């Protein structure tokens, strides 16, 4: 299965200019496009190698669409300010995330379209792709405007049509990286803390996609509650890193095993500290 998602952030800044609009697009865990309205000349830009092969009608069409969106979102910020009777002095933010998910055969599994105002849910398109869920009285004004204006019928046509068609295309074009799971490079490090304890750290480095399970076991017993598990972090090279550490009593190190499950691994790995 695969997904395509766009993320929009629209932020006002009174006394500091017009609102800022930033958009990013992803296929699975790979950022592939970006747009920022603060840029001297704002443009939808590539962020992954396999999208660089899209022609200029693509980039221009996307830039036009992003600017019209930035404009709709600045108006939306003013509308929200009136709906909420807020002061013109405060900075406010609208966020949006939408896209489609496809199955292994490429058929639309699910469409998404959610918006937030000041970090809170505002309105979302339902799974039926024909109705909206509004979070408050202000969002109901929007919902009624969207029902009158047949917005859901338009979004459905986008999600079932263009969204799916384009994702299928991106997956074929990026097949070598998007459809080839990179397994983690693993190792266990040992760090005495004192003469009686030591940290065992299990590393999973350079993996793709982000989804991974890194766990420690002591004599085949899961240590989730005692494991310091850092949030999956970008390595900066489109791959991910994660580590799970356990503080262990000196002399117990050989009883600890780290277990790594990832798409790119045929069979799960089992690692120990190798002195």
């Amino acid at each position: 299965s695969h997904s395509m998602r766009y993320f929009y952030t629209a932020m006002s800044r009174p006394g500091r200019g017009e609102p800022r609009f930033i958009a990013v697009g992803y296929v699975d865990d790979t950022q592939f496009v970006r747009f920022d309205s603060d840029a001297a000349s704002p443009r939808m830009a590539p962020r992954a190698p396999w999208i660089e092969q899209e022609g200029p009608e693509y980039w221009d069409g996307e830039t036009r669409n992003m600017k019209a969106s930035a404009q709709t979102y600045r108006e939306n910020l003013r509308n929200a300010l009136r709906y909420y009777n807020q002061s013109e002095a405060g900075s406010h933010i609208i966020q949006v995330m939408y896209g489609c998910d496809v199955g292994p055969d490429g058929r639309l599994l699910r469409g998404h379209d959610q918006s937030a105002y000041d970090g809170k849910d505002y309105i979302a398109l339902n799974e039926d792709l024909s109705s909206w869920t509004a979070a408050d009285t202000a969002a109901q004004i929007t919902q009624r405007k969207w029902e009158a204006a047949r917005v859901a019928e338009q979004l459905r046509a986008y999600l079932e049509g263009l969204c799916v068609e384009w994702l299928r295309r991106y997956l074929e074009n990026g097949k070598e990286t998007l459809q080839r799971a990179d397994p983690p490079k693993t190792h266990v490090t040992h760090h005495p803390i004192s003469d009686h304890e030591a940290t065992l750290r299990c590393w999973a480095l350079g993996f793709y996609p982000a989804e991974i399970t890194l766990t420690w076991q002591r004599d085949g017993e899961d240590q989730t509650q005692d494991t310091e598990l850092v949030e999956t972090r970008p390595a900066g090279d489109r791959t991910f890193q994660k580590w799970a550490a356990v503080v262990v009593p000196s002399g117990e190190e050989q009883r600890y095993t780290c277990h790594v499950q990832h798409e790119g691994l045929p069979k799960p790995l089992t690692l120990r500290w190798e002195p």
């Binding site: 993320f7 952030t9 932020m11 930033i22 990013v24 950022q31 970006r34 920022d36 962020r47 900075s91 933010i93 966020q95 995330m97 937030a116 000041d118 970090g119 809170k120 849910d121 190792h187 490090t189 760090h191 940290t199 750290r201 590393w203 480095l205 850092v230 949030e231 972090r233 970008p234 390595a235 900066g236 090279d237 890193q241 580590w243």
Partner: protein
Amino acid sequence: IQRTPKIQVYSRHPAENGKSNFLNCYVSGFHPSDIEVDLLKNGERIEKVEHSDLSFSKDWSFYLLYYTEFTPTEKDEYACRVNHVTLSQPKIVKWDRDM
């Protein structure tokens, strides 16, 4: 709505003294979006620092990766300094090659 940033300072590759690498400062889980992130070498601000495009998680909280090219040594100290509306004083997270 205000959410304080989570901060991770680390290298792209395992650290090897004298071998070039990337120093990362990943800031995530924050709101609103305005944030100030500085990477430090022996307490001084590193000037050549880039960042990822503002994105957000399913919970609407923002994340950004700040990164700089660096060469770890035995005596040099590296850190990340973060400021956000939620922070009383900027937060400094030291780089530990084992983390």
